[PDB]
Design a protein around this ligand. Sequence first.
Ligand code: 8DG
Ligand code: CA
Ligand code: CA
Ligand code: CA
Length: 326
Amino acid sequence: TLNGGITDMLTELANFEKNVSQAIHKYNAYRKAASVIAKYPHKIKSGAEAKKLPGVGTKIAEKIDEFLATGKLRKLEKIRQDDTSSSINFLTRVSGIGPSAARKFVDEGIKTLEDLRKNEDKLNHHQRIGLKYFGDFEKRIPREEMLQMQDIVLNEVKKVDSEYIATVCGSFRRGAESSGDMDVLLTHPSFTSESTKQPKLLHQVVEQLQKVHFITDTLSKGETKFMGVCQLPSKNDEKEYPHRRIDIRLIPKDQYYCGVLYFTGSDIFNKNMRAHALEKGFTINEYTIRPLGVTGVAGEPLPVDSEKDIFDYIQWKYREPKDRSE
DNA sequence: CCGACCGCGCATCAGC
DNA sequence: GCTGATGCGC
DNA sequence: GTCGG
Ligand SMILES: Nc1nc2c([nH]c(=O)n2[C@H]2C[C@H](O)[C@@H](COP(=O)(O)OP(=O)(O)OP(=O)(O)O)O2)c(=O)[nH]1
Ligand SMILES: [Ca+2]
Ligand SMILES: [Ca+2]
Ligand SMILES: [Ca+2]
């Protein structure tokens, strides 16, 4: 965190553009600059020094000069004073409340945690659960708890069908000492790109995890993606563990490497890598990497036997998960 | 100067 | 009910 | 907000 002051500033600007302005390209511009600066191995001395980095342009260089001189950014000091922006920014921290709903809630005079808690009937299901665990979802998960959580998920999945493979991805797979939440990649041989020889594959796993009281709430659920809430068991007289967010993604078994690349991230890493894919005439998603024809139409799925094959196609040296934390 | 900015699953809703 | 757009999220 | 063409 050589440049923590700067990257914090940029992230707050990023958050303003997403939540308030609803300017997603600006949000992404700010996040990209923050990311490139975060890995830059020097304490930055000027906006000019920063503008050398890709993604840092004229306007952010100016802000970095202002920040270095004064320790502050006038633009942000103002945003912080503005009640409508403060309220919107607050409300979007509830899972399920995005920029649009936040602004609509403010319009109706719902703008504090108390307001939310007295108007539960104005929330959809996701939002109500996001509100219920507002505090818990703020907390990070120690790797040691992630490890206990992995063990429960892996062993319960095995009890359902020993042919399931469950892989914990996200920042955990990147080696992080703490994680925002748990991400499980699920495969089963019955579900391939060619056929689905077995229904309820995700359901069965979700039910078993609910049965043992690991999964406690559901935010959304379909055939291939679960988004919900889980909690470690606690011992006699112990305070309960906080509730945690969990995502489970069922991916065609033959498309595992594209899936685990996607689910391992980071999100900014994924965005960067997919952009680069396009520059190189490929398109990457969680299933496949395909060539872009002479017109911009995706061709057939290229063969993939490893994460490295994907990097190879786009002429990137292989990067271990622990170095994908952009 | 300006087009393009990654890709997609689930929930909600409007129109038909 | 279906379809397509939008919101929110990974 | 930034960048390549
Ligand atoms: N292609 C793409 N992938 C994304 C996006 N957002 C996003 O989270 N992903 C991927 C990469 C992430 O590592 C993975 C899991 O999301 P996550 O919110 O749990 O993030 P994480 O594990 O890296 O980090 P964290 O929980 O410690 O905060 O989903 C996106 O916008 N585009
Ligand atoms: Ca995570
Ligand atoms: Ca997650
Ligand atoms: Ca995230």
